[PDB]
Swiss-Prot record, chains A, B:
Region called Amphipathic helix (AH), residue ranges: 305-319
Reactions catalysed according to its record: an acyl-CoA + a 1,2-diacyl-sn-glycerol = a triacyl-sn-glycerol + CoA; all-trans-retinol + an acyl-CoA = an all-trans-retinyl ester + CoA; 2-(9Z-octadecenoyl)-glycerol + (9Z)-octadecenoyl-CoA = 1,2-di-(9Z-octadecenoyl)-sn-glycerol + CoA; 1,2-di-(9Z-octadecenoyl)-sn-glycerol + (9Z)-octadecenoyl-CoA = 1,2,3-tri-(9Z-octadecenoyl)-glycerol + CoA
GO biological process, one term: triglyceride metabolic process
Pfam families given in the database record: MBOAT
Assigned EC number: 2.3.1.20, 2.3.1.76
Region (Intracellular loop 1 (IL1)): 159-201
Effect of residue 306 to A: Does not affect diacylglycerol O-acyltransferase activity
Protein name in UniProt: Diacylglycerol O-acyltransferase 1
Effect of residue 310 to W: Decreased diacylglycerol O-acyltransferase activity
Subunit structure, interactors included: Homodimer or homotetramer; both forms have similar enzymatic activities.
Length: 406, 406
């Protein structure tokens, strides 16, 4: 009979096959084959140490010598302040405007305090400073959501006053609040879907992933990105467009690989290990941002938590409390650009305003890729927009900081 | 409301997402970025020549100086002989056993003749010899199917004698036969599903793919695989197991990449370009052989044409004309191993019997991977079975030929 149907080839541009889970297994197996010996050497070297005990002892025996963990611990006072304000206005005190302005004061403090500290203290490491600011902005967003959720459910109980799952007031416990603090998400919500058990094997796999990709990224930086700069240690702040782009074209690809490894090490390994140590269940940290035939589809699927935050605490409100979805989304990108700048500049005491420029230029870039390319061609366009794109801004900052110091 | 469903992460081992078409676009864009300048230089150098005209002139002005195209042209006599036998026994001459033994003689000739020529003529290049043998084995399989299909439809017309689409006898035309000869498939069938038009853009894309990957593979060989041998030019025929494996571990990865590029350049670019020059429509040359959580699933999806051939001319018959599916599939692997050996050894006048050994050891390897691993773990096991696996046999042969001559 007819043993020749009229069809089209899999890889072909328009078959619509899309079942390539097994290309990634190839990437995994090649990475293992190509770095396994080195990783085993580095593990049998470093991992035999007593890292947790020695670090906690060396810290506790003399604090104030690392102001970054000092600051990370100091964030607890803002956490507790927000908890206390909520619990006070839970019974009826602090008429709603009072609680609102107390929350606003607390949040503005959470922002302006660690920045002021890292700016007016020289004995702090830029990596520790970045981690401190990261913790503080995560706390800012988490507490913003805490306030909004508690306000919503309180006004719901108020309207009901005109007449297993946890109800409104009985949730305000220290354990609940801290659990929300350390949970891999930015959207507060009672009754977080817990996971049944711990799955020690899964946990171990994720820790191994973290260690592996950490060592691999150290290797990438040391052996591919640093020498390319050491060959000409001259900052960008003084170069001209020609030399800037001539250097960036040589720096791009390794930067992009480092960025991909940041993603996989943080958004899938770290967060999963955390959510496993403390059964959290949800674990939708990212959608298929890769096969994204647009930019507005890339942002809606890279870093899910931040997306659903910007949506249900910053986009939907400014639509119900306003109009002009264009204005709203531009506000989203504006706030995110400010946050990027606050995140990268302040730890390095630079203000070149570059990351802001990149996040903002995303908008014309988005319209460009939307008007011109389509399909897999559009996906390639987005990949280009990622290789040179945004993650080159952080690279420019780190470049002009490294050449100026080493 | 509930904005936290209980789900699992995409990359995670058991979500079952599998929509990674866009990882491959990343591979494409990275390859372009990393080889585009070099490819444009090599194109602006070589492609300006007059390759077709000059080659046809230099051949036609003095034949017998390249016996490989001589032999490729000589295959036409076997093609015409099979055509003639079919047309004669179409009217009634050559009682079925006569036609059968004439076909058997013709096929045995198609096999034993080019081998004898390339074995008893020293002025032939090993690459040209390989191409000649490839053409002859393709012709062998195509004519085997031609015979079987014509026999089936003839006996169908015979049973009907006891009482738009093309019927049985009106197909035996030179144009039809030659069209089947040059069509990217091994299963003869009247009324091949034609494609509407030519799609010049598609054609150009495929030719560019061929040229690109050709230059890229030349680069791979010259700059990664050759020097690794030139550092120690000693044949395997004399080494010991230790040194053999010590060299193979260093040769494996580049070999595997060369093999992948063979696949993509031949099974998707070359065949598609051909089937486009001559609207053929079908274009199912391969199924998803990568994400293949087994070996028996890898073979059933790598090189579709050969699979459906072995099935509906060599497996199904030996099941209806026999039993013991185990015996049948072992016969399939035995014949394929003989064909591999005939294909690689004879052009190099070696007989180390290695490729046969690899194709045969696939069987215990298949049972191994089937019993032990599962899921993505099984897929990784198969990838390993491909990296060291079978495509190392051809590498051993080419190694022991190259060290002995250069
Ligand atoms: O039904 C059930 O459930 C059972 C099922 C069981 C198993 C199944 C079965 C088993 C084996 C094979 C089979 C074996 C060997 C083999 N080799 C090729 C091949 O790709 N050749 C390499 C090559 C290299 C170079 C080249 O180009 C150039 F020019 F370089 F030479 C062209 C090709 C394709 N094969 C297919 C098929 C099917 C039967 C039924
Ligand atoms: O779809 C409609 O309905 C229309 C409309 C709706 C709204 C939508 C939208 C949503 C979100 C964003 C947006 C913006 C910025 C942003 N940045 C992050 C991010 O993850 N990258 C920074 C980073 C994080 C961690 C990190 O780790 C460490 F530790 F190194 F710091 C390093 C860097 C996530 N973002 C998300 C923008 C727009 C647009 C469409």
């Amino acid at each position: 009979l007819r043993c020749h149907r009229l069809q089209d080839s899999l890889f072909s541009s328009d078959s619509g096959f899309s079942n390539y889970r097994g290309i990634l297994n190839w990437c995994v197996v090649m990475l293992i084959l190509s770095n396994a010996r080195l990783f085993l050497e580095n593990l049998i070297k470093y991992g035999i140490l007593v890292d947790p005990i020695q670090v906690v002892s060396l810290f506790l025996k003399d604090p104030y010598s690392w102001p970054a963990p000092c600051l990370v611990i100091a964030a607890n006072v803002f956490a507790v302040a927000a908890f206390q304000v909520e619990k006070r206005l839970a019974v009826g005190a602090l008429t709603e405007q009072a609680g609102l302005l107390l929350h606003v004061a607390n949040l503005a403090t959470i922002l302006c305090f660690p920045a002021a500290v890292v700016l007016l203290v020289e004995s702090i490491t830029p990596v520790g400073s970045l981690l401190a600011l990261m913790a503080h902005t995560i706390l800012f967003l988490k507490l913003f959501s805490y306030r909004d959720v508690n306000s919503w459910c309180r006004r719901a109980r108020a309207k009901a006053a005109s007449a297993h799952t946890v109800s409104y007031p009985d949730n305000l416990t220290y354990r609940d609040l801290y659990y929300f603090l350390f949970a891999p998400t930015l959207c507060y919500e009672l009754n977080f879907p817990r996971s049944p058990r711990i799955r020690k094997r899964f946990l171990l796999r994720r820790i191994l992933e973290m260690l592996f990709f950490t060592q691999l990224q150290v290797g990438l930086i040391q052996q591919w990105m640093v020498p390319t700069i050491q060959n000409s240690m001259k900052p960008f702040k003084d170069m001209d467009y020609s030399r800037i782009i001539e250097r960036l074209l040589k720096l791009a690809v390794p930067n992009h690989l480092i960025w991909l490894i940041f993603f996989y090490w943080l958004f899938h390994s770290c967060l999963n290990a955390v959510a496993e140590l403390m059964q959290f269940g949800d674990r939708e940290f990212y959608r298929d941002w890769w096969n994204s035939e647009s930019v507005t589809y890339f942002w809606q699927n890279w870093n899910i938590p931040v997306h659903k935050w910007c949506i249900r605490h910053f986009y939907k409100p400014m639509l119900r409390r306003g109009s002009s979805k264009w204005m709203a989304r531009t506000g989203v990108f504006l706030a995110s650009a400010f946050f990027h700048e606050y995140l990268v500049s302040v730890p390095l005491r630079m203000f070149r305003l570059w990351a802001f420029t990149g996040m903002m230029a995303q908008i014309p870039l988005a319209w460009f890729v939307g008007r011109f390319f389509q399909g897999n061609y559009g996906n390639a366009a987005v990949w280009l927009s990622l290789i040179i794109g945004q993650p080159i801004a952080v690279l420019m900052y780190v470049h002009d900081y490294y050449v100026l110091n080493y």
